[PDB]
Paper text:
ELAC2 is self-sufficient for processing of nu-tRNAs but requires TRMT10C and SDR5C1 to process most mt-tRNAs. The SDR5C1 tetramer forms a base to which TRMT10C is anchored through its ‘adapter helix’ and, together, they form a platform that binds the pre-tRNA substrate through interactions with all four tRNA subdomains.
Although TRMT10C–SDR5C1 is required only for 5′ processing but not 3′ processing of mt-tRNAGln, the pre-mt-tRNAGln remained stably bound to TRMT10C–SDR5C1 following PRORP release and association of ELAC2mut, suggesting that the TRMT10C–SDR5C1 complex also forms part of the mt-RNase Z complex for canonical mt-tRNAs. The structure of mt-RNase ZGln reveals how ELAC2 recognizes and interacts with canonical pre-tRNA substrates. The T-loop of mt-tRNAGln adopts a characteristic pentanucleotide U-turn structure, which establishes mutually stabilizing tertiary interactions with nucleobases G18 and G19 from the D-loop to form the canonical tRNA elbow. ELAC2 clamps the acceptor arm–T-arm ‘minihelix’ of pre-tRNAGln between its NTD and endonuclease domain. At the distal end of the tRNA elbow, a hydrophobic patch (residues 268–280 in helix α4) in the globular subdomain of the ELAC2 flexible arm interacts with the conserved G19–C56 tertiary base pair, stacking against its extended aromatic ring system. The first is formed near the tRNA elbow and involves hydrophobic interactions between the ELAC2 flexible arm and the TRMT10C NTD. This interface is 1.9-fold smaller than the adjacent interface between the flexible arm and the tRNA (158 Å2 between flexible arm and TRMT10C NTD versus 308 Å2 between flexible arm and tRNA), suggesting that the latter interface has the primary role in ELAC2 binding to mt-tRNAGln. Consistent with this, deletion of the ELAC2 flexible arm (Δ250–298) but not TRMT10C NTD (Δ1–124) abolished the 3′ processing of mt-tRNAGln.
Author numbering:
A (entry chain F): 92 to 156, 176 to 385
B (entry chain C), E (entry chain A): 7 to 261
C (entry chain E): 54 to 189, 234 to 401, 414 to 467, 479 to 792
D (entry chain D): 8 to 202, 222 to 257
F (entry chain B): 7 to 103, 107 to 202, 225 to 257
The structure:
RNA sequence: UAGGAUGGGGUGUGAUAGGUGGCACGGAGAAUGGAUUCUCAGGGAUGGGUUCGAUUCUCAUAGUCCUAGGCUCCGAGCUCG
């Protein structure tokens, strides 16, 4: 409550701080030694409140304004994607998300990683031929598992993916594993259906390079990088693409698309165009 | 071949009936469009040329169809093919405990009246007209083709009345085929899956894409010209009788 | 005005690095020493030079202006339009002397702010120059001390109590209100007037810091009697926050000097970068020497009143909370260095295999890096120990004495006593600028060792005479320490110019015990010379210098015992080497078989090259490679080929790094 | 089936009556829903105080609604519904050798009694069944329909009858899918020749036995079972 | 009632065969578990007591099954009911263009031999034993129950060999009913679908949970005791013959 | 239409397979008669001209089918249609109060069902290499499963079992091959030689199935309502 | 090795030394004539710092793009100071 009074003050000072604060987010607020970190956290809460209230307002404004099937709601589509997922989990090509990076990740990065995993899995379900997604090295009581169960709620027990505490080397023949990383010396020429691709679920905004390469070289796994430059002009943009863009690229190549079709999912702001 | 055949096509003003008429007239046949008087079939009959005539008749009524058939026999002297494409769809749950609504009886009755009873009302009178024909070489006098749906085997939620009617058509397809077999009239049933008829094209693009993706192969809504093609194939092939053909791309309807 | 300002100690006064500060501010950046090796130290510790607007020199002396030429070249390469120097007015004459062995102010513009010029102020600092004349146009008794006064910072605006009188908060309408009160102007009659402290933090007049250099006891009284210092010292007007003293320990212990610091007040700090500091400056250099020592110990020997002793990277913030900051202090730990070498994939088994496989003169490679100094390799240098009492310096690059002092530690004084002659072969900014540092340290070493002060012998091209002559006349007396011999007099076809020249060259052979001394003209520039020495023992050493494969050199140096040749570039770019008048590896290698040398040594590696060049399969048992601070004896020739595998393993990453860079350059070409 | 309450459409005779007699014997409670002029009142007297006859015309919503209200008055709940009422007609669709066409009124009447009457009963009793407290298995009730094998292979002249029973066959799965979130099971029995092997006519008691088996077994849903001795 | 009947149950060491043995032995029927010697059949027989016997036999081999039937005849003197619960499965696609792999012929033939040929082998050998019974009242001499999973109707991807074998069992159900009718043996088939059988254990438990949730009602996997209840109902009821009963809670298979 | 298509017909030396080859070659297609060496198929191949060729193969073996498909790919470079007409039958009752012999059941099962799957799995290997046309189709696979799969007569237990297996496996194979773009269909031929079905009407239906792009995963009873 | 350009982690874009405004599309969970309600994600590279308020103000780290070169001082005019 000392800090509750402190926030009342900064609010009395007229700073960007929220109207109210909950206990658990206050206990999160005290998780920041630097006063700048507390500032940025508070501005994040303030802006959340700001947009939440703005959208409630616009919601209140709009309120002033022989079929063959009953409306095919979101649930029916979800069940159809469920059946496709259940088939993929048996005969689909494996795709691995390699956990264990929980140590290297600040809270902001861990949250954003969870968000990207949620979107990537969403795009995976809708595809015509999904991968069989593995979460390896996924600590049961780690930070990520608790956030995933928080974000999915009771969906978590029902997702059609394999979650395990084992490593990927304990599941697949080590000759067939390929660790995808932008720093690889080997350039991916073609998508190979007999190999197992590993993606590190790791978000750090390009800030500690070589982590995936270090994990790969520590073992005797094969490694590859995407041929971004060879088939696409470049400009100012990181080469580590998001998880949902990675998965939508792999899903495009898997369906026999060519490179000039697969790289459409790269953000246009990063490159001028094809060569 | 179909050259010189005279066809009576119910529900011919749009959808599968129109596509069948367009094909048969294009292939050199003659067609009679059988549809409601207030429909837009008069324009289509002008489009197809003097081989085609529009007959305003409501298939639920004996007198309308009898007048239309008398017109057809006056204009062309014979009936060689009949295609049943008329019908209506209604979606409504039998009962919904959350909100307490119950399937109203009049929607069920009018679905049976248009789909199931209208079809039999057409079949018996057209079979009456074909029974006067001189038998073709091989004992055949004519062919009657019905349009069931995949809803007749795996109905989804809220299609109780529709599935009931199409299941009745499927059930009754065989005893009628046995009744008219001694006379030399062939009876066949086509069970189309998701087809780009006006019943489905009026839906939004999102649900249209979802329905198209549900088909295993080819992953698209059926094209009515392919229904017309199967109808022609049934007309040419002397040995298809008393059978239901699913034209659905191997799709199975999820609940 | 800037919100944060802090100092940083780049060099702590150690004998091998000199002393230098670094004033950081948001709007401007400043420096207060430009001696030998300062450029290398600042590059190693990632100190940006992009916006180095002003450079302050506290004393005209080669120990303080030694690395000035290196900085000038670096600023020109950075693209800075103008750089301004400040210090004694003689800098202009010094600047004139610099252009003889360089170009004249190519592109960039140079300016000088002498002490007599009016004070200079900026958006962040006001600077006053105080001239001090020692007791008892060149002036050898002038030292300049600096007193920098910060700008007044407006106090913070108190918003919490601002709502009590009802001032608006959270809108741009308060911006003119805040500007007025922060400037000392009362806000107008908003129902009633509010003035100054009723809503605003009182202003901070600014904390000043002083940098003082006292090279000897002769300056103590002039500092005490200076009136300008008393203007700030004895008063309460913004008591100078910190005074940096750069003076030998013997000066500080004087009672009169000691009382002078104390009169500045109790709150004032005192920073001392004297000759008593014990701190490692070149961590990477220490790492490599420790790493290489695991291979062969002999070939790679190991290197060597309140007051605050200075350290490397020591800081002192000034605008924020006035506190001392121990966060960037360099930390040397040999155990970590040896641990990194042992964990290498292939390093450990190879060194075991090497050891189970198994004096004068001795060659020490002080410097092997080319034009610009880099992180690991200094500029060219080579020490030869002919006899336990004599030695010969083959090239004197900038900061050579610093590398020599680190290698030998406390023995440096004895070695300089044995220093007989210094050879200058071609007048490049990385082959000769270190000479003045050697002479002064040699004089100091001779004084400590009690040897007689006999002048050193320098054999060099006559163009070097003009550079030293102007420097001696305008800046600092040097020539009374040297007896210079023109390089042309030692040619194969030379003629006796004067009887005096013959006495010196005859003296050189007797002093250095050589049987004969010879020189030859290589094809690099105008008046570029090689050399060759033959001892009575019979061994011959030939030094090429910057060159390309030449025929005059081959005829003269046949059957040499050891040849040292330039290896700037590799086989990929022989055309560029010809254009830049340098030799590639195979060109040098081809030269060695033709010259029929017992052993081959390479140096002058390019800035492109980080640690090693490419070891082509053409590398036989006679061709070797050179590294900084290595020891080569005549008996180690059979050993040298066995060292190739361990050196490849120990530098796996960098050689891997160089290949990727070469690949990337190719890729950009391909993608063009 | 002890204490369970059933509404048996067409219970005055035939398969409905045989189901009521067996189930009540086993300790259940039965409501006979049949036409007012039927002789089922004697049967409801015969079965004792656990049985009640409710007069209702299945094609009319009001009659069935009042019959269900009677069931709510007597027993308070409905657990099982068995649909058995119906009639049959034999007539060829068209007969060229005699020039005779199947009349439309007969076709409409058979459809009225067999197919739409069954849906009317399902739709109303499901409203009654929805008021039950769920079984420990989650079940609220069971609905059983009768669609003879004529829906699959009709004889000559059974077109209207085969149409009605094929309608019920098609109707089974969508109603089961409709009522699944409510917890009502919908099942269909395909009786044949009821009064290769067994060569005799079927005994209605075997139909009653199957009805009890369907009631007891929690996992039979949305399926048609031909009980026809493989003819 | 089933009181006093003797039942031979193939695959009776686990799953549906064990559930059926549990029910009939509990109801007072004597049972013989016919299963491979590798399985723990003798442990279950010892657990179930004096009315249960384990017969080691391989269903694809004529001499083992003949020995097992001889053992049953020696112990109890007759066989009144036979239940075929033995079966194996394989999950392999017919052809996979992406992976460039083809279903092996040995795997298909092995699954086909165990599931389809073994079932016919048991039916044809048991019938030789059942042919010796004096008929029960009503012309029945014995009962044969088969197991043909719902894959025979709507088989999934990668279930081709299993679906082919169960489709064969479904196809030949009626022919055997016509074959054995003059001698009074009924043949019946159950389509259990998702059950408590370990075949639903090789799949990951999340797939099993999804499949259980997808059942319309009850939204769970079947309990083998419900299969045993249906088996008893089939044994008791004389008029179920030559028909396939889907026991799946109305679930319909999607690919 | 079917002009220019290459069809592989098993059991093509006689009966329905041969009548299908005659129709497709008359319509301008190319056909490969895959049948036993003693069937006399080389005479039929000679009759139909240079657009048709005979490849001796026993369908129950992988090697013979592989060699025949290699021969077809050499001759025409492509396979677009596969028709499975090979088969045998027996009429022995399961038990005759005598027991049905096991060798006859194994033989008819593997000739009808096992031969069909062996052909399907190898042709799909061949068919998977075609480029998909404007409709995305890569090939059509057509199977025979007599109406005995639905209403098998007395003594047709083995035959009905084999055809029932073909019917049951039609849909899962169609689902397997759907992402490849291969359509799978089944025909159930009835009484072939109010008269018996003429094999030319079966060949006509096969052509209709080939032409119509939307028929997939279905069993068609060509039985004249019996 | 250096200098610059710059970084929207779902995608396009704004308010441009400080106050103002963001907009349009997309995703996750739980419920109902193609719309609705609740809930989740809303840090304009990462970490410090300043100001009454920072996306824009400053530093450090990392990614990415572009670019990285050479001697005259005077008269004798190949040497002389
Ligand atoms: N351009 C690219 N090429 C190959 N793999 C890439 C890629 N961009 C992203 N990925 C893969 O997707 C993941 C997220 S990108 C994150 C990069 C990594 N965490 C790092 O610090 O460098 C990575 O693990 C990488 O395997
Ligand atoms: Zn040079
Ligand atoms: Zn050089």
């Amino acid at each position: 409550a000392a800090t509750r009074e402190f926030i009342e003050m900064w609010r009395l000072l007229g700073r960007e701080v929220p109207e109210h604060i909950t206990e658990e987010e206050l206990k999160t607020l005290m998780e920041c030694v630097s006063n700048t970190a507390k500032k940025k956290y508070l501005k994040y809460l303030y802006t959340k409140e700001k947009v939440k209230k703005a959208r409630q307002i616009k919601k209140e404004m709009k309120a002033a304004a022989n079929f063959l099937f009953l409306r095919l709601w979101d649930r029916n589509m979800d069940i159809a994607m469920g059946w496709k997922g259940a088939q993929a989990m048996q005969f689909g090509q494996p795709l691995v998300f390699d956990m264990a990076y929980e140590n290297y990740m600040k809270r902001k990065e861990l949250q954003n990683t969870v968000s990207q995993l949620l979107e990537s899995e969403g795009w995976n379900r809708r595809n015509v031929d999904p991968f069989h997604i593995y979460f390896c090295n996924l600590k049961i009581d780690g930070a990520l598992h608790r956030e995933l169960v928080k974000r999915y709620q009771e969906k978590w027990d029902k997702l059609l993916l394999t979650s395990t505490e084992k490593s990927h080397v304990d599941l697949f023949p080590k000759d067939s594993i390929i660790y995808l990383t932008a720093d690889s010396p080997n350039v991916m020429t073609t998508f190979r259906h007999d190999k197992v691709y590993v993606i590190g679920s790791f978000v750090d905004k390009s800030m500690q390079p070589g982590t995936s390469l270090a994990k790969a070289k520590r073992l005797n796994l094969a490694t590859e990088c995407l041929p971004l430059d060879k088939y696409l002009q470049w400009e100012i943009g990181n080469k580590n693409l998001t998880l949902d863009q990675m998965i939508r690229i792999l899903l495009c190549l898997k369906n026999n698309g060519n490179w000039q079709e697969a790289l459409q999912f790269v953000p246009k702001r990063k490159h001028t165009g094809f060569l | 071949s179909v050259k010189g055949l005279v066809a009576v096509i119910t529900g011919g003003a749009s959808g599968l009936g129109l596509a069948t008429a367009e094909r048969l007239v294009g292939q050199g046949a003659s067609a009679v469009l059988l549809d409601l008087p207030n429909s837009g079939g008069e324009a289509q009959a002008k489009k197809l040329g003097n081989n085609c005539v529009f007959a305003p008749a409501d298939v639920t009524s004996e007198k309308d169809v009898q007048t239309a058939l008398a017109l057809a026999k006056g204009k062309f002297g014979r009936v060689d093919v009949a295609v049943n494409c008329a019908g209506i769809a209604v979606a409504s749950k039998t009962y919904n405990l959350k909100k307490g609504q119950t399937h109203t009886l009049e929607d069920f009755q009018r679905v049976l009246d248009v789909n199931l009873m209208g079809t039999f009302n057409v079949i018996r009178l057209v079979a009456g007209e074909m029974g006067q024909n001189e038998p073709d070489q091989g004992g055949q006098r004519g062919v009657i083709i019905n349009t069931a749906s995949v809803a007749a085997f795996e109905g989804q939620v809220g299609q109780a009345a529709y599935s009931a009617s199409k299941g009745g058509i499927v059930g009754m397809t065989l005893p009628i085929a046995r009744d008219l077999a001694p006379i030399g009239i062939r009876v066949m049933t086509i069970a189309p899956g998701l087809f780009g008829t006006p019943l489905l094209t009026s839906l939004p693009e999102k649900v249209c894409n979802f329905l198209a993706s549900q088909v295993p192969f080819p992953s698209r809504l059926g094209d009515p010209a392919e229904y017309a093609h199967l109808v022609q194939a049934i007309i040419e092939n002397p040995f298809l009788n008393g059978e239901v053909i699913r034209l659905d791309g191997a799709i199975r309807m999820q609940p | 005005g800037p919100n944060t300002v802090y100092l940083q100690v780049v060099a702590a006064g150690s004998r091998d690095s000199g002393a230098a500060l670094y004033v950081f501010s948001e709007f401007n950046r400043y420096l207060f020493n430009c001696g030998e090796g300062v450029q290398r130290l600042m590059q190693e510790h990632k100190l940006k030079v992009a916006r180095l607007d002003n450079i302050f020199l506290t004393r005209m002396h080669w120990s303080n202006v030694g690395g000035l030429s290196g900085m000038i070249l670096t600023l020109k390469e950075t693209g800075l339009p103008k750089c301004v120097l400040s210090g004694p007015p003689q800098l202009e004459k010094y600047l004139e002397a610099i252009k003889i062995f360089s170009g004249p102010l190519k592109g960039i513009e140079l300016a000088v702010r002498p002490h007599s010029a009016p004070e200079y102020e900026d958006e962040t600092m006001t600077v006053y120059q105080i001239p001090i004349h020692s007791e008892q146009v060149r002036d050898s008794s002038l030292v300049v001390a600096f007193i920098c006064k910060l700008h007044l910072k407006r106090g913070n605006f108190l918003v919490l109590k601002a709502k009590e009188m009802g001032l608006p908060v959270g809108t741009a309408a308060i911006a003119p209100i805040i500007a007025a009160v922060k400037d000392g102007k009362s806000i107008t009659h908003e129902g009633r007037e509010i003035l100054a402290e009723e809503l605003c933090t009182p202003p901070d007049p600014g904390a000043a810091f002083v940098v003082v250099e006292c090279p000897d006891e002769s300056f103590i009284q002039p500092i005490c009697e200076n009136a300008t210092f008393q203007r700030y010292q004895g008063k309460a007007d913004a008591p100078v926050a910190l005074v940096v003293h750069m003076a030998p320990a013997s000066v500080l212990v004087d009672s009169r000097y000691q009382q002078w610091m104390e009169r500045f007040g109790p709150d004032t700090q005192h920073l001392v970068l004297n000759e008593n500091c014990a701190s490692v400056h070149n961590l990477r250099s220490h790492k490599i020497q420790t790493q290489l020592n695991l291979i062969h110990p002999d070939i790679f020997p190991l290197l060597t009143v309140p007051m605050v002793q200075g350290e490397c990277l020591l800081k002192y913030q000034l605008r924020p909370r006035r506190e001392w900051q121990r966060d960037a202090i360099i930390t040397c730990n040999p155990e970590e260095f040896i641990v990194e070498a042992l964990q290498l994939p292939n390093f450990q088994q190879s060194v075991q295999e090497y050891r189970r496989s198994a004096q004068y003169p001795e060659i020490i490679f002080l410097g092997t890096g080319s034009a610009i100094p880099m992180k690991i390799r200094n500029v060219s240098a080579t020490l030869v120990n002919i006899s336990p009492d004599t030695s010969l310096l083959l090239d004197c690059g900038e900061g050579t004495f610093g590398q020599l002092c680190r290698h030998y530690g406390d023995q440096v004084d004895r070695v300089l006593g044995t220093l007989a002659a210094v050879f200058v072969s071609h007048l490049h900014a990385n082959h000769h600028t270190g000479l003045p540092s050697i002479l002064l340290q040699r004089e100091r070493a001779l004084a400590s060792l009690g040897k007689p002060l006999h002048p050193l012998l320098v054999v060099a091209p006559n163009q070097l005479k003009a550079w030293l002559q102007q420097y001696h006349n305008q800046c600092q007396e040097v020539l009374h320490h040297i007896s210079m011999i023109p390089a042309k007099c030692l040619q194969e076809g030379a003629e006796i110019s004067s009887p005096a020249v013959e006495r010196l060259i005859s003296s050189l052979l007797r002093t250095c015990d050589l049987e004969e001394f010879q020189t030859c003209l290589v094809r690099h520039c105008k008046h570029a010379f090689g050399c060759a020495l033959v001892h009575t023992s019979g061994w011959k050493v030939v030094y090429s210098g910057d060159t390309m494969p030449c025929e005059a050199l081959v005829r003269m140096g046949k059957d040499a015992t050891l040849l040292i040749h330039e290896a700037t570039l590799e086989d990929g770019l022989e055309e560029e080497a010809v254009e830049k008048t340098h030799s590639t590896t195979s060109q040098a290698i081809s030269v060695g078989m033709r010259m029929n040398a017992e052993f081959i040594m390479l140096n002058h590696f390019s800035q492109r090259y980080a640690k090693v060049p490419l070891f082509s399969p053409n590398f036989s048992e006679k061709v070797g490679v050179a590294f900084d601070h290595m020891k080569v004896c005549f008996g180690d020739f059979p050993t040298m080929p066995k060292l190739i595998p361990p050196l490849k393993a120990l530098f796996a990453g960098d050689i891997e790094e160089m290949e990727e860079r070469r690949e990337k350059r190719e890729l950009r070409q391909v993608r063009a």
